[PDB]
């Protein structure tokens with residue numbers, strides 16, 4: 001397994017047709033997971049499954065600019081389960097990140113940070129065993 005938190009460089013940033021794939025297994029009794037597509041200190045796209053927020057499961061997405069979080073986008077469809085292996089696919093499209101989990105479409109997140117070629121790191125954090133993180137062009 002890879003060391004968590006893990007930093008995957010994205011050389012030259014992201015671009016439409018770039019597909020990022022994360023494989024791992026959620027820990028027992030997991031509380032949270034986060035993917036952070038970063039532009040320097042800014043977080044262009046934070047994808048944050050919460051397993052116990054007031055005894056509810058929710059996916060929170062947001063952007064952090066100049067150290068400030070913006071408006072959250074929340075998805076109640078929650079395809080993760082403690083103890084189970086998962087695949088997250090993030091496909092960069094012209095106007096949004098498109099996310100599928102275990103081959104099922106989950107959500108889209110419109111680009112707030114527009115300099116896609118400057119979003120050149122992916123951080124992976126939280127309560128997982130990380131198997132692999134990689135990218136390819138489709």
Ligand SMILES: OC[C@H]1O[C@@H](SC[C@H](O)Cn2cc(-c3cccc(F)c3)nn2)[C@H](O)[C@@H](n2cc(-c3cccc(F)c3)nn2)[C@H]1O
Nearest residue numbers: 032033034046048060061062069070071072074125126127
């Ligand atoms: O915005 C994203 C940030 O959120 C803050 S928590 C703010 C609360 O969500 C704000 N809020 C919303 C509502 C509300 C929404 C709708 C209806 C209504 F009635 C109320 N009430 N309060 C988190 O710390 C922040 N973070 C998470 C992590 C993090 C670090 C390592 C692993 C990991 F997995 C995760 N690092 N930093 C980020 O996830």
